[PDB]
Symmetry: C4
């Protein structure tokens, strides 16, 4: 019974547990490169992806993101025709990159075919639990039919799950169980891995195969994004930080003379029903209207450039490979 | 001086200290089995027991629990005759399982004979301190007279105490010193053991004998329940989470339009008064009314099923044996 | 430079860091013994001492404490005649034990002589910093003149300081730098030792010589007292928990229809001036009126009896020698 | 892959993490020496420097500091001619010590020549990132032209950076990346080092060369200052604690009867605007007016004297070399 003895051995770190250590630098924030290659046909100018959620990304959001040099994932809480047309809407807007989310269902192959005929640039096969035979089988199935299509699969949190996805044929792994700002998985199911540990463990494995990972969830400030990249992610995915912006879908409601938008987990009661007996693992809330996406992105990327300047990272490869962290106690959060 | 040198060596974890790690799964939440076997004559469809507290479980609660696949323990803050008819009332509802609390007093044997006569399915011999000669001796005496009766004995929080209860004749051990929501033991006495550490330590001992443990107390969320089962408990006992439901004893009070219900420790001033020099070790508060028990159980089991889904646990045995935790700092509890 | 390398090696625990582990018990709370022998002529029925502070202990408080089986220390913020008469007042109240505080000053010997002529039962030579040549010299001086007098010296926090006091001739060591509820030493001077660590370290050393220690400061609940005893103290000293009671000196003022009493550190601005260029290391505040001392004591002792019942301690010697602690994280404070 | 494996090994402590341990003392607080020598031509009576920030130090502040036995750094958010007359104003007040901030720009040498001409006692070459080729090269060039001028260079937070600044010619190193009260670096960039760990790491390197360090930032209480000196700094620099005093630049604002003063990071939007594409790394707030500098210094030095009293430190060298800390948990910060 080795599993009995190992039950409490693992330790995990999240964003707040840690800081990046400054090192010798020859490169100003304005002159560092923030480009990343997820694959030969998916090269991003900035390492940011907007979440495939129904209160985050439709055509308008994905267009704005692609123009900033990033990528948007069109969500799956709409019919096949609606999504294929959302993708097409982005592609016709001047050779912009776009991705699209698909559930591991019977109709997945149908949906994917329409998305591919619409010339999608990457499909996202993500469930709440990526380390499942369902996901593995679907990825194998899609890979066999579409040898050249970019497949992002997730979400996972372990090296073991990362290996299973890579061998099933995914060329990008999305990492994150439990860190979402709208996520209640930790409270409902008692399940999760602190996000910095998950990213580093998954990346350790992925690097062996030259596969990139996406850090998905829990990024609350630009500094967290720099941390997530330095822990080994090629790119980060944001929900909450993008939900307040003009280009995100949803009405801008006014309560108390303050403009707000609705942001909700895809595992919330409302979302789960638009996606048609599980217990909800997400909540529904309001975020402040942030204005146009461009302002949020320039602030994020600016945070990252400053981070890279301190680390002496000329490019993101250096950051992933060489940046060092120092660990602090909870009292170390107050000092900041 | 060996004991002097080891005073501060031990470390313990509570629920908020850890998360379960996802693992290879091929079983959906709806497909998983949540059945649990405590003995060959006490088999539960869901791993949930309602606390034997005078504001949590009487016959109505025990009936609603048995129907959902769990078990209620009829509290002992009432006469022998009152307790025996409560038990018989539950059994009247069509062979439902029911348990009954018994204190450790010279009274105890009389009460138990009445509960056996009324067909209890299990007796709970529990005191604040399970690792005491009094409790040991009473279990010995009860086992001698009733070879086949299910005896649950607690509360304990160490392997050493678990072993003692098992050797006396308890076939189920109840674990938890200090974790309860209404418990002031750790403030008044300075005594307690972090509940995941206690469950795991007692499980480690009890497994050697094939004896199940109950994780008793401290469970606020359904995730905490999944953590308790994964740390080695067969089943959990809840007071707080059940106290506001319609089936629990007690009047629904209305303050400022809001329906409340009173919940108190059995070591509170009020409870100790009803059950008759010790300083109180429990408080008395109000919890929100929550409607029918069924709605509360369904969310709990749902949370558990999601948990087993992420773990690949096709049943509770896999969960106890295989699930792995990861530990985090307090700053990691904020996400 | 060994001291450079060792600068950050020590770890310390306070009350909240820890819990007592239940063990096999044959003894009910009502039948355990809480008596302690500090010396052949100073035997206490309950292990409690009230602080020698000007808002805590005068004759009335020391009388009430002695009758409960404990001990009160008459404070030194009064003239010699006033204190000698305060002591006498206690002794004439029917053979009650009493102690008296003295500062390490030139006039210390004068004050002590009057206290001894008044038949004091123990003098307390405590300063803010007991590990000082001033305190050592005074203790030697008093021991040489009064071979039989009980001398409690403090306050100290290390094994080294405990050894220095014991060898200078103190027969009881009072432990505590920084844990006081009214103490700002930690914020003003950056100086302190977490109280459980200090008690255990000091006791480890004192046991070698058969000398008892007093845990002084930081006890906020009865459980902390059980912890302090289990960490090796013979007895505990309380300030704040006794300052609200009827027998404590000071006016009972009413603000908002609520009765309050004034409690202040002896290093506070107000106290330091009644004791006649240092920076204040204590504050001044209000505590709720608690009624008669008897109620507070019965609650404290009750907490301790319950603690002993859980530990299976028939007497305090067992608790000191055998009780085991388990350490918890800060999240472990919430569970309680 | 060695760097990959060591990503998470390092641990760091801040002020709230530790306390100083009392030790054998025979020296009273009034008897202790708080004098500190930075170089043979910059000797301070008290180990305190006011920050070179446009809401902390101009000539009035620098004069009041020099009189108390410390030093002020004239900030650089003003023209060369303005800075040189500020410096000359302080020197006019009877040979008081004064320092001046200089940015790392092509401008820098011109400004420094004007400051040298005005008789500065020390120049502070400091940027957000001290461990940069730009800063190294500028110190090299300044040392070459001015062999005997005191050069303070920062900010840094590693032994490696400390060594680099020393080899370039800095004779004093300023330490602190992220600890400041108005600093948002750790949130915007994710970058920083816990201030006691940084000071100690840089001290460890600098001692090998007999070079002093300044602990810059994060000091809220006088105890924090004692901790910084004991972790190996010769002296501390304060912004926050000095910003509300009468001598600091800035108008006293009155809101709801309460006198406030504005305090902002030099990397705030407002400061960056006055000092002329980077994202802001500092905030702008108000601190309470605190009256004369003298009252603030007296409490600080008093706190320090008590600290050295408990430590047995008859002087600052003993404190750096001998004082021992003890580490505590966050629950131990609550007492
Ligand atoms: C209802 C809940 O919803 C979500 C949870 C977390 C992230 C979400 C992101 C987007 C949309 C919904 C999300 C859920 O899917 N829970 C859940 C729990 C355990 C599961 O285990 C499996 C599973 C296990 C083995 N094979 C296939 C699926 N699916 C599961 C779904
Ligand atoms: C008043 C307090 O009540 C409770 C405390 C904790 C959990 C409770 C759960 C249900 C009902 C009451 C509870 C108590 O029994 N305190 C207490 C403390 C120490 C004791 O030690 C012994 C004991 C020790 C040795 N032999 C027999 C009994 N009984 C004790 C009772
Ligand atoms: C003003 C401050 O007051 C107190 C601090 C802490 C506990 C108190 C309890 C009762 C009354 C006053 C207290 C103090 O005494 N500070 C202080 C700080 C360092 C000292 O170091 C020495 C000292 C060192 C070496 N020899 C003799 C005395 N006395 C000191 C006094
Ligand atoms: C805008 C920000 O301002 C400050 C940040 C932190 C401390 C401050 C103290 C005083 C005044 C301004 C401060 C900044 O300079 N950010 C920043 C971030 C990274 C950098 O990296 C480099 C750099 C790297 C390599 N060579 C030259 C410069 N300059 C940088 C500036
Ligand atoms: O309801 C849900 N429960 C748990 N996680 C969710 C849910 N919906 C979306 N997520 C995840 O949370 C991420 C967004 O996290 P955020 O950037 O911190 O708001 C998404 O990209 C998903 O990976
Ligand atoms: O007053 C008491 N003091 C300490 N523990 C108690 C008291 N009353 C009940 N308990 C325990 O706490 C459990 C319920 O805890 P809860 O589910 O966290 O509210 C019960 O099953 C008992 O084991
Ligand atoms: O002003 C002071 N500064 C620091 N400690 C003090 C001061 N006055 C009294 N003390 C200590 O604090 C103890 C009281 O702590 P309490 O029981 O937690 O309130 C006293 O017995 C003294 O040891
Ligand atoms: O805007 C800024 N961002 C980060 N650090 C700053 C900024 N402005 C000043 N500092 C640093 O913070 C120190 C003052 O910190 P304080 O004493 O904690 O308020 C200064 O001496 C600078 O080293």
């Amino acid at each position: 019974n080795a599993m009995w003895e190992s039950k409490f051995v693992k330790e995990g770190l999240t964003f707040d547990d840690v800081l990046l250590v400054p090192a010798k630098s020859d490169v100003l924030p304005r002159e560092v490169s923030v480009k990343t290659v997820l694959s030969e046909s998916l090269q991003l100018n900035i390492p940011l992806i907007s979440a495939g959620m129904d209160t985050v990304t439709e055509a308008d959001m994905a267009i704005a993101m692609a123009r900033q040099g990033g990528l948007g994932i069109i969500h799956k809480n709409m019919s096949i025709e609606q999504q294929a047309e959302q993708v097409d809407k982005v592609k016709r807007s001047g050779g912009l990159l776009v991705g699209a989310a698909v559930g591991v269902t019977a109709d997945a192959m149908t949906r994917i075919d329409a998305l591919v005929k619409a010339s999608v640039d990457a499909i996202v096969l993500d469930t709440a639990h990526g380390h499942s035979q369902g996901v593995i089988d679907k990825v194998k199935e899609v890979r066999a039919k579409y040898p050249s299509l970019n497949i992002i699969a997730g979400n996972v949190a372990t090296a073991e799950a990362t290996k299973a996805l890579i061998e099933a044929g995914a060329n990008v792994v999305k990492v994150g169980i439990g860190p979402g700002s709208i996520c209640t998985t930790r409270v409902v199911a008692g399940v999760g891995v602190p996000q910095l540990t998950a990213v580093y463990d998954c990346a350790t494995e992925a690097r062996k195969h030259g596969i990139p990972v996406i850090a998905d969830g829990g990024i609350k400030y630009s500094g967290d994004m720099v941390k997530a990249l330095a822990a080994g992610a090629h790119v980060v995915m944001l929900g909450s930080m993008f939900a307040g912006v003009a280009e995100s879908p949803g009405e801008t409601e006014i309560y108390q003379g303050r403009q707000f938008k609705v942001y909700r987990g895809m595992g919330s009661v409302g979302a789960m029903e638009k996606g048609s007996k599980l217990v909800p693992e997400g909540i529904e809330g309001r975020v402040p209207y942030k204005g146009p996406l461009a302002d949020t992105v320039h602030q994020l990327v600016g945070g990252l450039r400053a981070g890279m300047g301190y680390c002496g990272a000329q490019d993101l490869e250096f950051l992933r490979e060489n940046a060092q962290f120092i660990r602090m106690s909870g009292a170390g959060l107050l000092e900041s």
